[PDB]
Design a protein around this nucleic acid. Structure first.
Ligand SMILES: [Mg+2]
Lengths: 98, 87, 91, 76, 49, 110, 9, 30, 76, 102, 88, 66, 71
DNA sequence: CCCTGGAGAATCCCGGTGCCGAGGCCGCTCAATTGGTCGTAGACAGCTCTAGCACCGCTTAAACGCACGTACGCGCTGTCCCCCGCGTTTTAACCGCCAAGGGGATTACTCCC
């Protein structure tokens, strides 16, 4: 990981970084330092509970637009769609009053 | 009767009560049963060391207990040596 | 003035144990100094332990716990044996 | 558990202790003495846990045991 | 055995496994007792001879 | 290269480092370390596995186990310093039980 | 002892 | 946190049950 | 001077038991801890005269007779 | 309160109440309720100065406990008057021998 | 629950006002304060045990007995200042 | 006697020297020197050499908490 | 400045009665220095006890208390 | 062989982003010294007391140096054991999954006002 990140900070040496669902949990310190124009969450059924550690880890990522992809949107839990809308909502800004 | 005689021992409790009241800390005080137990323990240890030193003197055919006999008894009973090194 | 110490009592204890043998001068001074040190250590430990337990109920259990925690097993156990018997005889 | 402080843990503790080379027959005796020390301190801790027969052991108990054991500790 | 969140887990294991995992039939062999009757009887006969 | 990789593998190359310099750099990096080192969960496991002998239902607290860990971790380090000084006092840069017993019999074990 | 190594350090 | 000092205060027979750390369970689970 | 000391001890033997809420030991007490081995009062053991000392340290005319005479025998 | 009357920063009324509750002796002179407080403020003030310069040494505005250990271990007098206490977040001062390093 | 947190902050502003604090340092300094106080008091009491006794001089002489002279002179000076201020 | 006089009267003059605490000083220093000498001897024989060289007693006293 | 007047043959005889087959002048000097340091480090508490004893003459109680404090 | 280039890179210190932290603001809240007395006990004279200071001065026994003379720590040497770092392999907690209790209450019921 360090060798890969060696040629990652200064130049535009890449556009897409292939990262798994669990890698971001331990590497969040290096991930959050970099602003990402776009991210995709394929198989959105992986994360469904708001109290989940992945939810807290990925909620506060700095970006502009978000998109989640799933094989099928979940049912039996309206909280799932509510949390999806929340993850498409985020209002946190620099001023903190928008 | 006297409380010391009531305990069926020799050591007097009142002296330890007086010397332990000094250790009272304001709202914290001590009881008589604690002093009685302390007197029992002190009488036990003094009887044990006296018996050991008297036997050592009898080995030396001396009718008077010698501090060298005391230290020899301490050496023989390693618990006493460990205690005296700890205290 | 007047001085207070355990001459007659320790002599009586020895007479009960070894009536023929007595106690010499510096041997008595050594015994008195050691017994005073033991008493002061037990009393200080009991006071600080009662303060640690944040309760002003100082029983024979304070002195007992002191005897356990400042003295090895043999003398402490035998002392607690004779003290238990003496206390239950008094009580 | 005998193998609590494992071999790499003892090795890095020794390296933190500033030793050039650490031989392969030195950790057993060190483990024995530290187990003896741990047994002593836990025995004292359980003794003063029954000072008021408290059903829980806290930092106060162990700091008591260590402060009367001669090896005083700080940071609290 | 109040808890039951996995009380159906052993039933599922039973259904899928077909007790070839819970307990398989072993290679049967007899007892291997080793004390022997003549363990403490050679000394007497040797002394007698 | 084990399998499909970024072109040709084997970039690790034979780059073995001789001891001494590596030992010096690792002790230098270890000395500045100030936090806990050994795993705490096996420590609490063992301390609970060696507490029921006196009595069960004793229970514990995080402050307790932390304080015992601090006591055991901050005491054997001075022992390590004493053993190392006794070792390099003699012509033995490596550690053997002789100097550790020497340290035990000069630090007043009893 | 008035100062010793109290101020130079 | 509800300590055991109340029992000691009410009855002087045994005042050993003075301080507890998890008997109240407020210190750990409230 | 032992008579006045004994009278003072007897007088003080009753003041300390009524110094507030004491209720010592709940009128009960644990029996002989571990096992009973105190005997009647002591162990009743002696020590020898010869190299038994050299056996003892392997098992682990004081200040001249003028000072032996100097220490006066105590009289009650 | 007591601090203004004594003209001293550290409170002494609570300290004197603790001393009275201590009952260390029958004769407890109450005329100096802040003497021990005075000596402890002096000690803690010199310790704080040492810790502050140590923290400023490594561009650390906040005092890391390692800086406190370095401050209390860099002086001969401080280690002499107490040297048997193991402070949390340890780490001895760097040292090396003439035989280990060229 | 009378602690020394306010006093510790005051002495911080007195010595190095620009310097901040941790979240566990105050416990260390409070332990320093009270443990030094109780040990000094115990030594003073054990020293006064021999002499018949039923203040400033006792505390000062206890400080001068064991605590180093380099600190003992400052301790005596500040104690005299404190007692004079109290009498003022 | 002259040693204790020179080390006692320098700190504060007019120090009368009674016979008490004079032989006690001799006994105390004798016991201390005996203990230290035994420690140095055992440290030396640990190094497999009967001779004494300064860092041996230096390290011994360092482990004496000096 | 009598502290340097301690007779070296005293240390010579003490070493001879103590043993050792090689007792150089360095050993004598170092043992003399450590003995002087220990004597100073005990007489300091002795004289402080005398000062906090309301007395100006050395007596056995002062050294007894000093050795009890020092162990 | 000393010296020069040639590269991995520790360290420096700066970024660069995320957060939690000392203390102020509101709330109040527990005791220190005034205010005085009760007694008490520790230093002001008084008497004394007791062996320490220093003295007397031979007299063995520390001071105290020196030649024989050899013992072994250390200088070197050879002789030679297993610490240590690169590449592998086997535990290990942790994030969830699943679903049947958890539990104070007040808000329909019915019994109290
Ligand atoms: Mg999909």
């Amino acid at each position: 990981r360090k060798e890969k990140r060696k040629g990652w900070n200064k130049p535009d040496a890449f556009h897409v970084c292939i990262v798994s669902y669990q890698l971001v949990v331990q590497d969040q310190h290096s991930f959050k330092r970099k602003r990402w124009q776009y991210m995709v969450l394929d198989e959105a059924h992986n994360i469904k509970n708001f109290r989940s550690t992945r939810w807290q880890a990925l909620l506060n990522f700095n970006t502009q637009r978000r998109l989640l992809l799933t094989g099928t949107p979940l049912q039996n839990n309206l909280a799932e769609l509510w949390s999806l809308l929340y993850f498409l909502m985020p209002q946190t800004v620099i001023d903190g009053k928008k | 009767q006297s409380s010391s005689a009531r305990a069926g021992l020799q050591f007097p409790v009142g002296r330890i009560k007086r010397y332990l009241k000094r250790h009272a800390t304001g709202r914290t005080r001590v009881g008589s049963k604690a002093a009685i137990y302390l007197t029992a323990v002190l009488e036990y240890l003094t009887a044990e060391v006296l018996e050991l030193a008297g036997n050592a003197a009898k080995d030396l055919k001396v009718k008077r207990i010698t501090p060298r006999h005391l230290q020899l008894a301490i050496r023989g009973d390693d618990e006493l040596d460990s205690l005296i090194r700890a205290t | 003035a007047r001085k207070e110490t355990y001459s007659s009592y320790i002599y009586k204890v020895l007479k009960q144990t070894h009536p023929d043998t007595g106690i010499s001068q510096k041997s008595m001074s050594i015994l008195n100094s050691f017994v005073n040190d033991i008493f002061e250590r037990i009393a200080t430990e009991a006071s600080k332990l009662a303060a640690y337990n944040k309760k002003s109920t100082i029983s024979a259990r304070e002195i007992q716990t002191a005897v356990r925690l400042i003295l090895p097993g043999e003398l402490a156990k035998h002392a607690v044996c004779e003290g238990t018997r003496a206390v239950t005889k008094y009580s | 558990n005998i193998q609590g402080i494992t071999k790499p843990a003892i090795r890095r503790l020794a390296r933190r202790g500033g030793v050039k080379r650490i031989s392969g027959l030195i950790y057993e005796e060190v483990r024995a003495v530290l187990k003896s020390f741990l047994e002593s301190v836990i025995r004292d801790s359980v003794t003063y846990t029954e000072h008021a027969k408290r059903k829980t052991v806290t930092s106060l108990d162990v700091v008591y045991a260590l402060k009367r054991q001669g090896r005083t500790l700080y940071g609290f | 055995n109040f808890m039951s969140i996995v009380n159906c887990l052993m039933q599922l294991r039973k259904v899928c496994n077909h007790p070839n995992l819970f307990e398989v039939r072993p290679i049967l062999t007899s007892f291997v007792l080793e004390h022997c009757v003549a363990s403490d009887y050679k000394d007497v006969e040797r002394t007698l001879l | 290269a084990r399998k499909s990789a970024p072109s040709t593998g084997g970039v690790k190359k034979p780059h073995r480092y001789k001891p001494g310099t590596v030992a010096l750099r690792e002790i230098r990096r270890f000395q500045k370390s100030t936090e806990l080192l050994i795993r705490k969960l096996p420590f609490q496991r063992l301390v609970r596995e060696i507490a029921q002998d006196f009595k069960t239902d004793l229970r514990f607290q995080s402050s307790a186990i932390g304080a015992l860990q601090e006591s055991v971790e901050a005491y054997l380090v001075s022992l390590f310093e004493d053993t190392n000084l006794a070792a390099i006092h003699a012509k033995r840069v490596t550690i053997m039980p002789k100097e550790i017993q020497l340290a035990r019999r000069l630090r007043g074990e009893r | 002892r008035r100062t010793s190594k109290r101020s130079s350090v | 946190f509800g300590k055991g000092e109340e029992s000691d205060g009410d009855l002087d027979l045994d005042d050993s049950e003075d301080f507890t750390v998890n008997s109240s369970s407020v210190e750990g689970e409230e | 001077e032992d008579s006045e000391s004994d009278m003072d001890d007897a007088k003080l033997d009753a003041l300390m038991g009524n110094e507030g809420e004491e209720e010592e030991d709940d009128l009960a007490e644990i029996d002989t801890c571990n096992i009973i081995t105190s005997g009647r009062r002591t162990r009743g053991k002696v020590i020898d005269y010869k190299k038994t000392a050299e056996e003892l340290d392997k098992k682990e005319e004081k200040e001249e007779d003028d000072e032996d005479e100097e220490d006066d025998d105590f009289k009650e | 309160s007591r601090s203004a009357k004594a003209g001293l920063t550290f409170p002494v009324g609570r300290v004197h109440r603790l001393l009275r509750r201590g009952n260390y002796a029958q004769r407890i002179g109450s005329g100096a309720p802040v003497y021990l407080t005075a000596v402890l403020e002096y000690l803690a003030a010199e310790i704080l100065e040492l810790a502050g310069n140590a923290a400023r040494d490594n561009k650390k505005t906040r005092i890391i406990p390692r800086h406190l250990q370095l401050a209390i271990r860099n002086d001969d007098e401080l280690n002499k008057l107490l040297g048997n206490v193991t402070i949390a977040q340890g780490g001895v001062l760097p040292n090396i021998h003439q035989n280990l390093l060229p």
